[PDB]
Amino acid sequence: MISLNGYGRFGLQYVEDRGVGLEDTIISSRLRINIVGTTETDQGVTFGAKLRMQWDDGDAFAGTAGNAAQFWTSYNGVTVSVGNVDTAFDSVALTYDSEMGYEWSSFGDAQSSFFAYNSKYDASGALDNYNGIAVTYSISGVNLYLSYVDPDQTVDSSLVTEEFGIAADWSNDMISLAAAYTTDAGGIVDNDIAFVGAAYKFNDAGTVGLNWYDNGLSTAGDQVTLYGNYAFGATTVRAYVSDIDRAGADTAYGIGADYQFAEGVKVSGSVQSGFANETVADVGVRFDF
Amino acid sequence: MISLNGYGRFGLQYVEDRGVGLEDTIISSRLRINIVGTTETDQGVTFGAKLRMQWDDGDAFAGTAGNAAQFWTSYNGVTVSVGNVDTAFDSVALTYDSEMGYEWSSFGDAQSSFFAYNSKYDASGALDNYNGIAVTYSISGVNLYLSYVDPDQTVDSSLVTEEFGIAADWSNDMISLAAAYTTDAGGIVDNDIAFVGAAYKFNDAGTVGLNWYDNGLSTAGDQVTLYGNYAFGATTVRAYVSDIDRAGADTAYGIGADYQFAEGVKVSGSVQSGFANETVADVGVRFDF
Amino acid sequence: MISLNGYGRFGLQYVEDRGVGLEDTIISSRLRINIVGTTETDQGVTFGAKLRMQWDDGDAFAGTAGNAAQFWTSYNGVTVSVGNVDTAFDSVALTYDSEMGYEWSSFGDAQSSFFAYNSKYDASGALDNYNGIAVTYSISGVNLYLSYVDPDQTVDSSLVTEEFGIAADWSNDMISLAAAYTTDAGGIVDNDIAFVGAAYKFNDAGTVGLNWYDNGLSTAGDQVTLYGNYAFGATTVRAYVSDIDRAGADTAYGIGADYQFAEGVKVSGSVQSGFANETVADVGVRFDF
Numbered sequence A, B, C: 001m002i003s004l005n006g007y008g009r010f011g012l013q014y015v016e017d018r019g020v021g022l023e024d025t026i027i028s029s030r031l032r033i034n035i036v037g038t039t040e041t042d043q044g045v046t047f048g049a050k051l052r053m054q055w056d057d058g059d060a061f062a063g064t065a066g067n068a069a070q071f072w073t074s075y076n077g078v079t080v081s082v083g084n085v086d087t088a089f090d091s092v093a094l095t096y097d098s099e100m101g102y103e104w105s106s107f108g109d110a111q112s113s114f115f116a117y118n119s120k121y122d123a124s125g126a127l128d129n130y131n132g133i134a135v136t137y138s139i140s141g142v143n144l145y146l147s148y149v150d151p152d153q154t155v156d157s158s159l160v161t162e163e164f165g166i167a168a169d170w171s172n173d174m175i176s177l178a179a180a181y182t183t184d185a186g187g188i189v190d191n192d193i194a195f196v197g198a199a200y201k202f203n204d205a206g207t208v209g210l211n212w213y214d215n216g217l218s219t220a221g222d223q224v225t226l227y228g229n230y231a232f233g234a235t236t237v238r239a240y241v242s243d244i245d246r247a248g249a250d251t252a253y254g255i256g257a258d259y260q261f262a263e264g265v266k267v268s269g270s271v272q273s274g275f276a277n278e279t280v281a282d283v284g285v286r287f288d289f
């Protein structure tokens, strides 16, 4: 069986004083199509393969292509994936929950470098022999994630830096906890990064959380992000504040809102301020199909 | 929801004395696939996104890729589209009705340069930040079209030439009228082009029309195309004559026929003569799927 | 109508002493998606078009694209195809039946150069004007194949070498015979190649066959491959031995097995030895979707 799914989004993206001779406000948009092939068996083992075709405004050649494939095998809550895999630091819960606006962005996201699923081709040639293995285990309320990425699998193993990641999250109706650790993140020797977060659903309607990171070799140093969101019917209001250890950095913050226009159609906007005083804003729509 | 549609065509394409050491007759063919994602809402607003994958004989690398995305929102007869849009001069009725043969070609089509939906990627890099907005309004028998294209939306607005177009058409059972005007067509300063056309369905079976153009900065100058077609059961016969103002040009003309082999399968052929005496012919099949 | 089908495969591929500083064992995988558009008519003539998107580990840019299109028309057992066609030497029965392992490989396959369907784009530009015509006729038990490939159809016909192929196979419940001949195979003047094979289903469970080739200008010279396979319930065991005329070559051989895990899911592995003493092994899974 083959299924197709995806989303389109478009809106306005503003970056205060973007550059000499550049418009500060542009129309930013994205089309994402996922192609998933799955083979179910009566033994209960499912096999799957996925390809993505994603276009973003500004993409070279005004064209769209597929990325590198991902393959998986699932059985009894356990999933093993190979190729262009989802990594542990990128898949744990809570770590991206301060994002807002129609492009799901936040200065409060981790300021470190690490491997993650590659949505597109890479013209530099750097990903040509990139290969990962990931294992996930979902055991009710608990999620475990393990990932191993070799950026160049054809070359002798001791000549390249491989990334090893581990993560777990846990939740009930009111509290959630999550932690992750990755050594040689992004294939950079000694770039060891870590995350610990927690969130409290202080209602049926609100949530408040705190994420802490060790950003490894990044110049940002350690980081803390405090965020919250509250739903009033179809409208959701979001906010965050984030601090990094880099000398002289400003406190980053953001405020945004979402409006659920219909099932699968969401209008979102945000106004945010960065660690170097950058001001960014956006307003747009995303529709899922 | 995601749907796929398209067409394949193949046949013989003859160009008298095509070039030293070249075959005059080749097998010309095209595969077009459209991928359309749509999200309908109970409020009556539809959201859509489309991508095209088109291959033509001769394409570089013997490969096929997607083009840049188009997004739209429709409500009550009004459609707003963004990104790789259909433009007013290219979407009005009548302007391409002298086309014939299995590749829908005619020297009687406008001999001007203007933006239109881009079916493929562009390796020159020229379309990378190209972005348009279009608005169409279909109000029974009447169609209005407006389009605005900025060929490089990231650069300051006064540093690039944007194309603005407007058009309308109108029809009843027997007469049709259409007009279009576009300033700085193709992003070329002062290339202002215009079209006015009319057609008469002088039966249930025949139609005769006349299109007039102002080709802006093109060397062709003003142009007039007179065409007609007549259906005899499954067979359609077509003809046209066209004249341009360029000094010394020949009168262009063409004669062709279509045969409706089955629903979605059409066999077509034509013999045509250009403004510089070029002789071209074709015969082939198109099938829609 | 548009349908999608394909397969994913992944596993381990070992090549003894692959190269200085290279891993001998890698994770080799492939994702293949076929997109087929078909138009059926009440006259009984079917029209079709197909595109393939295939990714293999190691592919340049870590991306996937479509290949060049193939078009066909079928009526009463006869199929005419144009564009990126299947060729006679590549489509006859028996010629690849010694293959084994999850990548369907065998040193006992013909060691000659010839055109075949191109699964991917070609960055060299060599296939840009490549165009073939093929005709197949399936007349109960009998299959005839004819193919003509012009590697550069736009250039004068006497300036390029075209490949012409013919083949036939025939089978009943127990015996199968097949033969093929291709002149100027691969567009190489005087590279004339030929195949003759036969197989005997010495049970409901086993088969033994012998293929002979004339490899044209290849340095391998003539070749003979003897192979067999036997099914024990869900498990199939395969073997082959092959000899070429090249001076000093070793006898190539291979032994493998397949396990039918479920409909559409097959686990396969093989250990093989080449004409230059290369040792190769593989174990993996293929799943069809």
Ligand SMILES: CCCCCCCCOCCOCCOCCOCCO
Pocket: A058, A059, A060, A065, A066, A121, A123, C060, C061, C063, C064, C065
């Ligand atoms: C096989 C899938 C198609 C992907 C191949 C595209 C290869 C194009 O690059 C060739 C080398 O030139 C470098 C291109 O510039 C960077 C492009 O991508 C960045 C997205 O905006």
Ligand SMILES: CCCCCCCCOCCOCCOCCOCCO
Pocket: A012, A013, A014, A025, A235, A237, A255, A256, A257, A269, A270, A271, A281, A282, A283
């Ligand atoms: C023309 C350039 C500016 C384009 C940016 C659009 C920015 C618009 O969005 C502003 C951010 O929206 C957040 C509002 O704060 C929440 C208000 O109170 C909650 C109920 O709506």
Ligand SMILES: CCCCCCCCOCCOCCOCCOCCO
Pocket: A010, A011, A012, A027, A267, A283, A284, A285, B082, B133, B148
């Ligand atoms: C008319 C000249 C072009 C100047 C361009 C400015 C046009 C602004 O956008 C108009 C339509 O397209 C884009 C944005 O989508 C709107 C955002 O979110 C939805 C409703 O709150």
Ligand SMILES: CCCCCCCCOCCOCCOCCOCCO
Pocket: A060, A061, A063, A064, A065, B058, B059, B060, B065, B066, B121, B123
């Ligand atoms: C991202 C979609 C893939 C499109 C990228 C292809 C880029 C190839 O070009 C790289 C630069 O070299 C120039 C190519 O020659 C022109 C090709 O297109 C013309 C169609 O026949």
Ligand SMILES: CCCCCCCCOCCOCCOCCOCCO
Pocket: B012, B013, B014, B025, B235, B237, B255, B256, B257, B269, B270, B271, B281, B282, B283
């Ligand atoms: C071998 C090179 C020539 C390939 C070109 C094929 C050209 C064939 O088509 C000729 C054009 O067909 C138009 C006929 O005029 C209409 C006739 O009367 C109407 C009822 O059929």
Ligand SMILES: CCCCCCCCOCCOCCOCCOCCO
Pocket: B010, B011, B012, B027, B267, B283, B284, B285, C082, C133, C148
């Ligand atoms: C046999 C040597 C190759 C010489 C090539 C000429 C072959 C001509 O075309 C044969 C089949 O393929 C293409 C054309 O489709 C026919 C056109 O329209 C349909 C019926 O009127």
Ligand SMILES: CCCCCCCCOCCOCCOCCOCCO
Pocket: B060, B061, B063, B064, B065, C058, C059, C060, C065, C066, C121, C123
């Ligand atoms: C139009 C479909 C996209 C295919 C175009 C890709 C073109 C990229 O090449 C541009 C020129 O540079 C040469 C690339 O190196 C070889 C790539 O393919 C081999 C597969 O591993």
Ligand SMILES: CCCCCCCCOCCOCCOCCOCCO
Pocket: C012, C013, C014, C025, C235, C237, C255, C256, C257, C269, C270, C271, C281, C282, C283
């Ligand atoms: C770690 C590198 C080695 C990876 C190669 C895996 C090779 C494994 O497969 C060995 C080949 O399998 C063939 C067995 O011979 C058939 C046995 O008897 C029949 C019933 O199973």
Ligand SMILES: CCCCCCCCOCCOCCOCCOCCO
Pocket: A082, A133, A148, C010, C011, C012, C027, C267, C283, C284, C285
């Ligand atoms: C753990 C460090 C990484 C070392 C890589 C070796 C891992 C070997 O493969 C594990 C999973 O992925 C690949 C192979 O599929 C297995 C083959 O066939 C199926 C069962 O017989």
Ligand SMILES: [Mg+2]
Pocket: A027, A028, A029, A056, A057
């Ligand atoms: Mg953008």
Ligand SMILES: [Mg+2]
Pocket: B027, B028, B029, B056, B057
């Ligand atoms: Mg063509």
Ligand SMILES: [Mg+2]
Pocket: C027, C028, C029, C056, C057
């Ligand atoms: Mg491989």
